[PDB]
Amino acid sequence: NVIQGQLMSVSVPVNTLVVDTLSPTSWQASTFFVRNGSNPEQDPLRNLSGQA
Amino acid sequence: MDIKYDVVIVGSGPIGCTYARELVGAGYKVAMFDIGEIDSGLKIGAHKKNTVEYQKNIDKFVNVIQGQLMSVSVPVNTLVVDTLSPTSWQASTFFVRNGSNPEQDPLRNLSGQAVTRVVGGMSTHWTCATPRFDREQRPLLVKDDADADDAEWDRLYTKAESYFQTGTDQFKESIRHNLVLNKLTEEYKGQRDFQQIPLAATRRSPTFVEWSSANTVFDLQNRPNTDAPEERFNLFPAVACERVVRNALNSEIESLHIHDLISGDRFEIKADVYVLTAGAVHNTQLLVNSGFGQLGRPNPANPPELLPSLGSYITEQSLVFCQTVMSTELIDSVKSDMTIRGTPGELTYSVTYTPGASTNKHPDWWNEKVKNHMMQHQEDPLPIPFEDPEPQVTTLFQPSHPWHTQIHRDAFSYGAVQQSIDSRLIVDWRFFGRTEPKEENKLWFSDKITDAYNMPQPTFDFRFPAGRTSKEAEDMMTDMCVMSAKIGGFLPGSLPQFMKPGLVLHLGGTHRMGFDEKEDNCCVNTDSRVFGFKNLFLGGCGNIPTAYGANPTLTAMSLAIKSCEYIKQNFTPSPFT
Amino acid sequence: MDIKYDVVIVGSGPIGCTYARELVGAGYKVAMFDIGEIDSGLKIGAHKKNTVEYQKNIDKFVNVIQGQLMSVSVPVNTLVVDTLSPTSWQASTFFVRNGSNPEQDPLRNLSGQAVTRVVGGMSTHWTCATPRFDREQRPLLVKDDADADDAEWDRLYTKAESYFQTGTDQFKESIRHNLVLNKLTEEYKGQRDFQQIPLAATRRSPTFVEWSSANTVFDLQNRPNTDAPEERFNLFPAVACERVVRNALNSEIESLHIHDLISGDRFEIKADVYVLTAGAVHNTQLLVNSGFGQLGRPNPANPPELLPSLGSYITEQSLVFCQTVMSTELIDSVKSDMTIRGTPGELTYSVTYTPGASTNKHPDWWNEKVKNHMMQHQEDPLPIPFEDPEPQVTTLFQPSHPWHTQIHRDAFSYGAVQQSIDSRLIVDWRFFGRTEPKEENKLWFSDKITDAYNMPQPTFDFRFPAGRTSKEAEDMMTDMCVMSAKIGGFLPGSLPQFMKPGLVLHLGGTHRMGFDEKEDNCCVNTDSRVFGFKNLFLGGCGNIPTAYGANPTLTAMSLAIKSCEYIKQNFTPSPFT
Amino acid sequence: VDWRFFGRTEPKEENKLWFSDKITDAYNMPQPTFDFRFPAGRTSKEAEDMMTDMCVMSAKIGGFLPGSLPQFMKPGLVLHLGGTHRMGFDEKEDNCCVNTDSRV
Ligand SMILES: *Cc1cc2c(cc1C)nc1c(=O)[nH]c(=O)nc-1n2C[C@H](O)[C@H](O)[C@H](O)COP(=O)(O)OP(=O)(O)OC[C@H]1O[C@@H](n2cnc3c(N)ncnc32)[C@H](O)[C@@H]1O
């Protein structure tokens, strides 16, 4: 846990996971926009995803 | 196989079988085609859960369901697998792989929507709940005359209930059923009514219920036969129906084009009357492949020649779900009338009650079952008999609670931790919301991508409408939380949740009914006849134009009955030759 | 229903059908009972995967398998659920719940062992792999004459292979099959031989394989019929066979007591010959219910009167599994013979080869399929045609590699992240080990706990033996790791692993064959006749007394053929009147 | 017992760490971005041979622990990234950034 607490991911690609069980009343995305410090420059298939 | 019939029916689900029942019985020479095959035992199109093995192990039946549901539209997969060995072949792009549909926006899908291709269709696996719609949920059949409309609906629903063997009595002596029913009745006294879910089923014994299906409506045996020597019917499984051929005037269908999947041959089949009952998605595919509506991505700049509302105004219900673990107070209440002496597993253990005591909270039949369970199974810590049937409770849709409810048990795949909880304690909760029909919600078909039967790939463009539908959906969730609490707390791993859109399989409005094609934005009239065409009829939930919460099959069946009445008045059976 | 026959057979799996085929054909009046029901369509007992839908959607078939596998012995669950609501009823002990078997030690189980109760038995879903056993794996039928023993086994296997329609040619023109076959052949040149898995199956088209089943062996139609007017056969589904009655001398069976599950009626059925083919677990159960062996927890103080080895020496194979993702080198090799001009998607794109050129690595048929795929589907990044059949590769069990191997694809439940990998790239690896028969490895039946059919509950006491069995199992794992790497790296989520004990369903030795009851610690002789009894025979994998890694059913069938040869020489069919 | 085998990766010009001219990180600095794959040839062959070697060697000691079966780790989880400001004798000839005194 100490280790995990002090490793911050270098480059996180934009997240394209589909969450389709939101309540109809919840604000819902129309696109996979740049969220949560993700890096839109990053090709997710040419990454070092574990680099921190 | 002739190529000439009085009537041809596409699909052998319960709605096609409604057409077959009415029209075969009325003396028509009928052919029915299904893309799927016979696989329910000797009773063709029967419910798969009516085996002794599945009545003994109902939870295994989830696998039967899953094994015959094929997802309608699966978007391109964008999951990153970055732990492959460097020697394995690795993608540079998220290419079209594994039957995925590149047309499909993953954020505007009905991801849960699926289809079944087997003789009997989805009625070989369905839960059998057959409630009527109240006026608020129900399409009009008579305009500007409420009494006449009600009368017509009661007549049709009564016949439909007869065809399905709907009843509200099959679980009347379950202890779990009554425990739940009585508690909710008391909790909502003066506010809401509770009753047994209306179920298309007949109890045969205390441990076997014969669930209804297509086969219940029509046995699907070829005719003439010994029981039916003057009737004419042929079922042709493993035949893909690909299109209906329009005349130039768009006033008549001239043939049905079919592809026999075993021999590979293709034919044109001729009939006086053509009935499409292939389900809400595949009736729409068939019509679009035949030149109705518009093929390809919606394009309002080029409106279609025929049936412009085809595949718009689609509705699917929101569904919330949880499971609960029965309260201690409710469990203790089961044995409230018992006098208990001794210590279990000892010789002095005694469980008794005084029948007829006016101080008894429960009737004699209940106390007798409890007494016997407790006396005969002293190792077991619960008062509920091992073979006690599941609850089957509902409070039906009303204005002040505009959702359908099922408080019950259906087949479920319990996680290993969950299997830790005694099944007697568990109750499932499913609340189903109504969805406003909106033109922007659509089912369309690719002009390039094809499905597993080389037909235009179905694509959804769907979101639950803003406004009432969305407010109601979230109020429904809250109501499930509130109501369920009265029975017990949630079961870990089955916490309150929305299900993936469409997993419910109650899709409607894809080929919707109305009085006037233009004014009511619709595809079929109240006889289920395609506007403009003398001899083309659609049956199924796709006809239903309204926002409904309750399970739709009974209402679709009622519409099909009415459709058959029109057919009987407008087409003459061939003389039996 | 009369209650008098020449031969009665308990169970309608492929081994009961072997007896039916032999003895119905030889003119005997035969009855066959199954506790399960007809549910594969019109072809009674057929492979459920032989539908167009399952051949288009093969991965859905895992659900069909799961829906008809009921776990034999599930120990008491000790999972802690401590996040229930305080109002919910909650356990103070881990009490006997949800059909668990309190006799079962969770650490000495075959937790993966399961049974199927449907007409056709497990042959309605099996993978159809039908290898012969080599001498090392195979029980002796002739002593002290290896050549005579080989000759008898060759005769028998050859007949069995004809009953099953076993072949090694059904995948010969698959690109993926040959890609894998050729690579492994080269890598192990001079060390191991590779061939197609022998499969009970007949190809009917490029995209349809008719997989064999009990139905292949015997069609299960009642006779006399039009095609067989002088044969006599009846099948009675939904009939639980409960016990055979012994005479006072323990020399003859006098009747079979049955319980019709539909009517509830019980009957005593009389025959000249009684054949138990209920599977390795349920044959043992019926025998123990009939006074053979010992009921209850093993007690060596208290010796069984009859068949003291029954339910001892049980064997189940170790099974290791992984999937791989095909190497970039192999994938590029598929297109080695192509010249590619231009850019995919453009007018100028061209993929050509030179037919018959002596420097081509691949045959013309191969190159033509690759060329057409690449030219017609320029969007696709792989050279493998979309409808290319799966690999079906084996190197058979040998002393230097004492395990059976299957390098193939069969029905599989892929997680969404694995669904990310193109299916053409995926290969399944399953290596099966042999287990030494040990007296201490037992299947026994409770004297208190009962199963869903009110029969004595099965209980395992099993561990993989120390010594050779265990060493070989681990060597087998390493072998799989080494061999599979030649083809591609592991697929994440399908990493190399041992499967739960018994999940393989290749249980043997519960009613084992030998020459001498005492000397060979066994229950039937080489005619499969129960020692001491004139007219009781057992068929199935329970007969196999040796340590085997290969799939046993073909071997069990061969033994049934030999058994029928004895019955024909020793019993006279009744005159057909 | 834990088993970790680490492979060597051939330096290739195409394998890059670069920085966005628009996107910024948590410290308002140019966002790092990778463009990386394990090179074909020796690197890839060796990585898979290494996997096999672990499977063979570890078997001498015991069988795999369920849930910790043989696997590649996500690229870079190892945190042994090198060569981003690489040393050599001659800037141009050795394609490098610092000399053997680590001087730019
Ligand atoms: C799957 C399911 C459904 C279900 C349910 C629970 C489950 C898990 N519970 C329900 C319940 O409690 N109450 C209720 O009203 N409905 C519930 N359902 C849904 C219900 O089964 C369906 O509404 C119903 O079966 C619809 O009937 P219909 O007859 O309209 O359609 P179908 O059963 O889908 O049968 C259509 C058939 O047509 C064939 N087909 C499809 N395409 C073609 C083509 N091109 N050519 C020829 N035949 C075609 C199918 O194979 C199918 O059998």
Ligand SMILES: *Cc1cc2c(cc1C)nc1c(=O)[nH]c(=O)nc-1n2C[C@H](O)[C@H](O)[C@H](O)COP(=O)(O)OP(=O)(O)OC[C@H]1O[C@@H](n2cnc3c(N)ncnc32)[C@H](O)[C@@H]1O
């Ligand atoms: C499940 C499975 C099996 C399988 C396989 C893959 C799967 C997923 N792959 C195999 C393969 O590739 N090669 C092979 O050799 N075997 C493979 N199998 C196993 C194979 O299916 C079995 O070995 C085979 O079916 C055994 O045949 P047998 O005829 O001996 O037994 P059965 O198929 O289990 O059928 C027995 C029947 O008897 C009935 N029954 C049971 N109890 C009673 C009683 N009390 N009364 C009357 N009938 C009874 C069953 O219902 C059953 O149908």
